[PDB]
Symmetry: D4
Subunit: 151 residues, 8 copies
Amino acid sequence: KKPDFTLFLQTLSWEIDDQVGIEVRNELLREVGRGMGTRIMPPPCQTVDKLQIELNALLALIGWGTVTLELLSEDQSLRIVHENLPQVGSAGEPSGTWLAPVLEGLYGRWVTSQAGAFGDYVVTRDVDAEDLNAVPRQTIIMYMRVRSSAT
Amino acid sequence: KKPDFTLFLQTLSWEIDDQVGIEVRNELLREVGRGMGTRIMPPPCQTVDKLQIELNALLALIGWGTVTLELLSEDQSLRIVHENLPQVGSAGEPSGTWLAPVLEGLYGRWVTSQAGAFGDYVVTRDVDAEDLNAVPRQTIIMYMRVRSSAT
Amino acid sequence: KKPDFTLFLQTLSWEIDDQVGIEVRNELLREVGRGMGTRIMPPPCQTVDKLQIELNALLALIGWGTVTLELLSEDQSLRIVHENLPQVGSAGEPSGTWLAPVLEGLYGRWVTSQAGAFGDYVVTRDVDAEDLNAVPRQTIIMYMRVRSSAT
Amino acid sequence: MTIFEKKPDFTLFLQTLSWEIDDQVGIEVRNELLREVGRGMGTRIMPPPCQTVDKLQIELNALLALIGWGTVTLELLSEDQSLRIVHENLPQVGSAGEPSGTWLAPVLEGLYGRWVTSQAGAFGDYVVTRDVDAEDLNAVPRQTIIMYMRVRSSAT
Amino acid sequence: KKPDFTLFLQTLSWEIDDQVGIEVRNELLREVGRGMGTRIMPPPCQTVDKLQIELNALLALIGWGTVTLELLSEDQSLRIVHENLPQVGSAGEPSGTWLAPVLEGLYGRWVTSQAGAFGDYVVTRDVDAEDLNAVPRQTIIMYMRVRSSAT
Amino acid sequence: MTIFEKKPDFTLFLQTLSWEIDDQVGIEVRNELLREVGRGMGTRIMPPPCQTVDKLQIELNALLALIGWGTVTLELLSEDQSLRIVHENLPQVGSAGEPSGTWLAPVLEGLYGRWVTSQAGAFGDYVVTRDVDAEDLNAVPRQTIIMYMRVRSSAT
Amino acid sequence: TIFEKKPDFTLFLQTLSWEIDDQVGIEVRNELLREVGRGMGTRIMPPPCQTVDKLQIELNALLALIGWGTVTLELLSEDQSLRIVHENLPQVGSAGEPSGTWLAPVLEGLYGRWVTSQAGAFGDYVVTRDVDAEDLNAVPRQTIIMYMRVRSSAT
Amino acid sequence: KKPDFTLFLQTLSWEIDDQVGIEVRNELLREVGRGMGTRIMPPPCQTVDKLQIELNALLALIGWGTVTLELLSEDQSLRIVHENLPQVGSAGEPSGTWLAPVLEGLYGRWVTSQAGAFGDYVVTRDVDAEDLNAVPRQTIIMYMRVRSSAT
């Protein structure tokens, strides 16, 4: 009686892909991720550890999984490991991860609101470590250039 | 703990309506409706009463509301009254009913499926009956009629 | 509690009806009710009022609705009004009441087990009554010949 | 303030139904009826046209999740000319069935029979049948059902 | 999934009822009420209206219904109306209200020192008021009074 | 307006009940009460007549699942002429009982005693007794109850 | 190995609300609660809406996420105001004026933030709780009446 | 419809921290803990093992995790290991443990109450026994020892 949207998103994912292709679809969904991050937001956090907690609490709110943030000192990169991306049928690459670019946008926006970053513009989905590690299907690894920010 | 898609659909609906406009959004949503209708289907119903029960059972599966069907034998039609369309933010005409053309596509398939397949039926929404009858916001009134007549 | 059987029962009701017809089906269903009645049962109750309470606790355990019992001052009968019979699609007479004969066997077993009945053989459901009151679709009204009155 | 339990439980009803049918008609006929019911279920809830086995697997599992009937894995065996179907957590309806607890298993043969046909570029007349020796050499859990989809030799 | 004790309590009430009096069972239950009152308690509330809110919060914690408190200055009493006492089969007077004396003890512990009422009080079930008001089976009426009185 | 979802919790009532009863009468009068309550529960919910130990185990798990009282395994030990009953996840009702947390354990004695007898056929006369010392070689969890079904002696 | 039941904060809020009221007055507590409200508003927010009806729908969806009730908005032309009726404020014991409405100032703060974001180039609004019209006639204990009026927000 | 307070508490944790700083917030929170313990309480417990069971029952009632109590010297010392303290954003030392002082105060009242009243005990959080043993973030290690208690 509380609405379920799985089936709707399953059919919507198929129709969109069919109509506009992978490239446009990915852009639409990043843009949706960015929009989502302007309706729900972390406070201004001091540490990456504190940000991890603020974000996991936002994810729990909508049941979209969990995330670990690792601050790599080279490229001053941020590794984002997202667990339990919701599944909406077989669409996406790999199959099941159709909603993965939404995360690119959402994290783009959420982290950029921390001021250690350069904007919500580019968050890179790693394909290599998402297929060389034998990472679970709904686990999404991403990378982000950051500034020299700490802890 | 089950994923909540309300926020994603709120933001997706704003995004789509900015890029493509009402009429293209409506045509995509109906097609999604048609696709849902090839995924979940009622059995061959002998009467409208029996069909109405079968349709409510399918609506129960995904929590998308309740339906009453009424044969308007004078008016060559069926009145479809869908209570409780799931609400996905303020988009749609009227506001709150973005998902309505999905119903049009879904009923189109569901009602033209078993015994309905004989006869060239269409299902279209009444956007004057909704403002005319003071129906609740998430109530969608639709009619099933035959296609064409001319000279 | 996790597996759902509604869809199974829906298609089971259609398959059984088509192979054996209404009459054999009613007999299979009554016999199932009597079997259910030998697996869960009330204690021996002195009064109809107390049996009413015991029967509703049993029904609450499986979610099959509520019942009121009425010892008819003297038809030498017991009126059973059962509310919210589980709906199993559109099969049954009237549509939606496929599971109604199970109740006949269930109350035949449950009541007989108390001081005052002649066996689980005959519980007749009232058809004309269900159309005298204008009774909701899932309210099932039944009558049992009874020995003498338990208050 | 009461939840008028809109969780009707059908487990007790199904336990007694299963005992009752097995008493009246026996194993072979119970199994055909159940396969037929499975076919029926497969005309009400359906996957979309999938290009690959792995995509089909995801689509089937979303359908089972929708009704809480377990999880499935599909594996192509070219050497055996078959698709292996391993269904886990078949709902248990009491002790009927062979082995006990697996009364509902034939419903899967009919269901997977409806759901796997014309999927992933498989074109023809196929039968999903259950394999009781396969379940055994595995030491498979009680509610795990193993089936093979093969080209039809005889059964329909 | 979580244990249900309704069946255990239905059988328990019967077994305790058969071995000992109505009255010995009622004193046992009253003592269990006092017991429950040493395990969950309200804060010291300034008014009777604040006590009512606090008592309902404690009732909601365990799901034992709701309470209204009325000061009756003339009659020198606090009327206590408890709605939706859990039903535990058909034991008790009237049937269904077997747990009623548990409230006598419980409200006994919960009310005495609140609202600037400083003395020695007894909470007593006024059964004769439950039929005076055409009160549902699971509604229990109690009066909080000063200790000693006549016929 | 109040909550759409609250069904009554009896845990708190039962912790305080177990306490008062222990206080008024001793352990053994408490245990005999709860045995009798168990026998009474065995008359309200029951298994069909089962062919085998495995089928009976499944049927009893179905009954226990109906009320949320745990799971059970049954083993025929044809050398002690006994049936070992291992009940897991006995509902805990405070700290009463021996060991603490197992107050409800004699309900299981009565309950299983009634179920087993219903399944005795023409030739069986059984009693079920709780074995607390064999809860030491198992070093079982607190809410696990071990019982033995044995032929009744009926001698002196 | 997951924990099953989600934590309940009802009891904790009941004790916290007593202790704060005991330590500081109605007044310090209320400005404390209004600032939490404003802080909540920077974390959950509506998109920019073009009408009041559209804003009403967007707010009810925010409120639905955290289960904090429902709101209706009504623009009043003859007054310079928008009436905000909030139903089912979560009840957190008997603290507050009236008892049970302790969380109400969070709402002033919350709607203050949301409504400022909705205000265009010309608006400069304050939202204030109107107590003596909640109790002018017969609104439920957990129904809060607020008015949004034109004048600068802070103090 | 079950109001969620996580977001209120995240924001309140920041506002309180901002205004008064760590030591004053902590003392407030210990007072809250003691107040929670005058509202929900264990019974008399002859042993630590009986207390542990009763304490876990009270915690399950509110969903605040689990506890193991270990006696080190018969009357001298108790170690209290608390699992799954509710997380409430990134506040607290270490981040995520803002609610920890409440436990100091709750256990202070729980273990101090009944037997344990006769010791003049104080419960205090060990901050580098948590990290020396590399305990989970929401696991709180406290000790009960002798020293002055009241204000």
